[PDB]
Write a protein that binds this ligand. Structure first.
Ligand SMILES: *[C@@H]1O[C@H](CO)[C@@H](O)[C@H](O)[C@H]1NC(C)=O
Lengths: 221, 97, 103, 58
């Protein structure tokens, strides 16, 4: 019985499944991600079409797991192949029930990787790229310490000193004076000082949205 | 405006849908307020909105003379709107008509 | 410890970091006393790594001494505070692959 | 040329993979209150590639 399933793999149907990966790949680029829960007419069809691709891949896992053993099939490049199938079924199952339901769909962007796995003429070049990554770990290690050594130093010297920006002196509105806020250090300290008609009060407008300052250690890296 | 055109029966179909979140909504609100500013005190008006369901931004639910006061209510209601849901022109236009 | 501090720090937290800073530099002074007693200083000057330890530990100690005065209240030269972090390079030399690549 | 196409094609998939991922994460979330100066956005796939390639060139 199981022999009947295995002999199917012999038949060159890898072309149709691979074209399904390519066909699906074209089904992801058309998906317009509207801002806030909106969805035009076409997006309604793709989700329906998404079910078909799910079935086509899901049956193959059964075809390729019974034929090649439950334990051995994961022990290959297909580990990600089953990785998509497992979590994609969760996405469709969980969405139909009704949070993080929408965000979980990101795993489907990994299907193109199956495309480079299917063709054996491209698996070699990818391994050529990866095989050259091992020596660069040392450079990565050095860059890791350069980040750490300099980030720690940045904390000590620039310990959240970018939180004083110039404010208008009239007092009608408490907003930064300059249209492009820049950190200021008031008198008694070295740095820039406001013009004739504004003052450097300790608010917070120096960095852009508080993302490019040395306040924390994560901000330092 | 008194001589340019005769009285009107306005009905502004604000499109508060997910696709208009951000700057587009600010432009929509400002334009609607300006439009209500360009209505005399002898023509009627209302402000609907469709987001897969055509509700009304205000408490009126019909045409309300676009008076000095009613304009203020419509302006406040328009200012306090948010983008959400899925656009549905068919239902919105049916509600409007 | 050097990576713990963040803006808007708590006065209690600031003290704790200083306490560890005093403690840790103390251990690195035990490294000094313990190492120098093992073999006399003339051999300590032999290798730069041991030489690089001279300025680091003393730099830490003077900072602790400067901590005795309190220009600020828990309601100025800040150049010797960086010597603590700079000692991390000694860790880098451990890796056989990296040091030869850099050397 | 039989290998340059393979290498360039392999690079193309990587940009596609991250470009598609960018849409799933930042798709339509760049609509901010400020004036719409966010040309380098992630809205639609053909315009997502330009944003991704911009990061690649940095
Ligand atoms: C704005 O409209 C929403 C609609 O639910 C309402 O909850 C909120 O209280 C309104 N705010 C003001 C200031 O009118």
């Amino acid at each position: 019985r199981r022999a009947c399933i295995s002999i199917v793999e012999w038949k060159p149907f890898e072309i149709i499944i691979l074209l399904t990966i390519f066909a699906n790949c074209v089904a992801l680029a058309i998906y317009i991600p509207f801002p806030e829960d909106d969805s035009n007419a076409t997006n309604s069809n793709l989700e329906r079409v998404e079910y078909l691709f799910l079935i086509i891949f899901t049956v193959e896992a059964f075809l390729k797991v019974i034929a090649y053993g439950l334990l051995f099939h994961p022990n290959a490049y297909l580990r990600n192949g089953w990785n998509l199938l497992d979590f994609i079924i969760v996405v469709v199952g969980l969405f139909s029930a009704i949070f993080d339901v929408k965000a979980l769909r990101a795993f489907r962007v990994l299907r193109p990787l199956r495309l480079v796995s299917g063709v054996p003429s491209l698996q070699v070049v990818l391994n050529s790229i990866i095989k050259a990554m091992v020596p660069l770990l040392h450079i990565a290690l050095l860059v890791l310490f350069v980040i750490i050594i300099y980030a720690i130093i940045g904390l000590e010297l620039f310990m959240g000193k970018m939180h004083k920006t110039c404010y208008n002196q009239e007092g009608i509105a408490d907003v930064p004076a300059e249209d492009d806020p820049s950190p200021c250090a008031l008198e008694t300290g070295h740095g820039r000082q406001c013009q004739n008609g504004t003052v450097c009060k300790p608010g917070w407008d120096g960095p852009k949205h508080g993302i490019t300052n040395f306040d924390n250690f994560a901000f330092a890296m | 405006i008194q001589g340019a055109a005769s009285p009107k029966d306005m009905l502004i179909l604000v499109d508060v849908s997910g696709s208009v979140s951000g700057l587009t909504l600010k432009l929509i609100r400002t334009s609607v307020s300006e439009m209500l500013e360009t209505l005399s005190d002898d023509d009627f008006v209302n402000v609907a909105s469709f987001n897969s369901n055509a509700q009304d931004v205000s408490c009126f639910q019909h045409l309300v003379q676009a008076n000095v006061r009613n304009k203020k209510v419509l302006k406040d209601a328009v200012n306090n709107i948010t983008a959400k849901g899925i656009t549905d022109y068919k239902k919105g236009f049916s509600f409007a008509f | 410890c050097l990576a713990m501090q963040h803006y808007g720090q708590s006065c209690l937290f600031k003290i704790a970091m200083n306490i560890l800073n005093m403690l840790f530099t103390g251990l690195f002074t035990v490294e000094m006393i313990l190492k120098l007693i093992a073999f006399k200083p003339k051999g300590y000057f032999s290798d730069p790594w041991n030489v690089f330890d001279f300025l680091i530990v003393i730099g830490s100690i003077i900072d602790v001494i400067l901590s005795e005065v309190n220009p600020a209240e828990h309601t100025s030269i800040t150049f010797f505070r960086l010597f603590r972090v700079m000692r991390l390079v000694k860790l880098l030399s451990r890796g056989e692959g990296i040091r030869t690549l850099l050397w | 040329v039989r290998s340059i196409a393979s290498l360039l094609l392999l690079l193309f998939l990587f940009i596609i993979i991250f470009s598609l991922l960018g849409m799933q994460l930042f798709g339509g979330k760049f609509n901010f209150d400020e004036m719409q100066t966010r040309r380098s956005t992630f809205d639609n796939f053909p315009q997502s590639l330009l944003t991704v390639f911009q990061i690649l060139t940095g």
